[model samples]
Target: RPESELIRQSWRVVSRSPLEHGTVLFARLFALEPSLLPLFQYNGRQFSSPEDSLSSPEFLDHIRKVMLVIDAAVTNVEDLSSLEEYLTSLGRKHRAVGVRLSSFSTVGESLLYMLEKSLGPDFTPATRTAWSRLYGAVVQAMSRGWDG
Candidate 1:
């Protein structure tokens, strides 16, 4: 649970302004998987490029929601069932949006990068490892949701 502590603590720092760094997180994901850009479902307008998507208010709002999900998962890191339930719901939503399984991995990677870039020295190796572990668990839970 110490890893959970690290995740919870570091994430509280992110709770300051998720929208600011959430854009960076999506940008990284777009860079890693440009094809995934179209997967983001915006009700108002459509975006043809990742740049436009990243700049859109809808996309930013979506990322902010994602940040809340991150906060929830980290807060309940010690509760495997809670995480499973959360990710399962998320996975269903993702499926509705035509999300590729690979996107989840990209999200995990981009989130770590975002934490490092935003937190700077506060993103220690141990914290990085903890977040990675947390994301891995998230992906696992999501995968189970996809299976069912």
Candidate 2:
């Protein structure tokens, strides 16, 4: 819960497959926030649609990029400075797209949902709490630059 080695391992387990996890993450994300679906168009294509992005190679690529950042946070959670920088960049990107605190919260909830679906029984209480803390950290940093 408090970001321990166990939580790190839990995140590691969830992050082992970035593409796989990202695919699920986005699916759950859009499901949770259908309004956000229109924002995922890439290169004149609708890659964010619930059914469309599932099979898009480009979507997979985007998911990979996202997972890389998430894996970095999981790997460097204790490195607060590193997380802060990551969040700064992330917040800027989100802000450019008009993302707000509620959006981050929506994504966070979907992330947890996706994790639970993927991890199955492996998703322990500690892991859930750890991820909660992780999302809190992510939201905190993103909020700082949301209005910038």
Candidate 3:
């Protein structure tokens, strides 16, 4: 599909610096849902503010992992079926950690926000649609973990 190509092309730019871009994504996430800040407890300490999370090494590592998951999705854009089980397990882990399925929608928005900020005018309507579809599919797979 042409959308798959667009996904790959746009991701190529962001993937070059996963941590840097991922930081933007997470920063946006906290802004959208400050309640999520407590989910990233590290060494039994909680981040009292969004800025506090940015300084935590563990929080930064979590950002890297989030980007890698997106990278995996981009790698298998043509057939996300390959990632179904893995994403489902990932979802289960998130659920175990107190993350709600609804929270993923907020994450989706933050992802697009980061893409738009990174790509500027190059992030066209079609690119946004393509990413929305891909992210929807990913979330669908992940949502399965909540079934049990």
In angstroms, give how far residue 50 of model 1 lies from its true place: 2.0
Q: Which of the numbered candidates is closest to the native, going by highest TM-score?
A: 3
Model 2 RMSD, rounded to 1 decimal: 2.2
Candidate 3, 88-138: lDDT as tens digits = 999899999999999999999999999999999999999999999999999
Tell me the lDDT of candidate 3: 0.93
The most accurate candidate by lDDT is 3
lDDT of each: 0.81, 0.76, 0.93
**For model 2, which pairs clash?**
none
RMSD of each: 1.9, 2.2, 0.9
- Model 1 error, position 28 (Å): 1.0
Candidate 2: deviation at residue 139, Å? 1.5
lDDT-best of 1 and 3: 3
Residues 1-148, model 1: lDDT tens digits: 6787888888888889888878888888888888887666677455788778866777777888888878788777888676677678778778777887767888888999999997898999999898888888888888765674
Model 2 is weakest, by summed lDDT over 10 consecutive residues, at 40-49
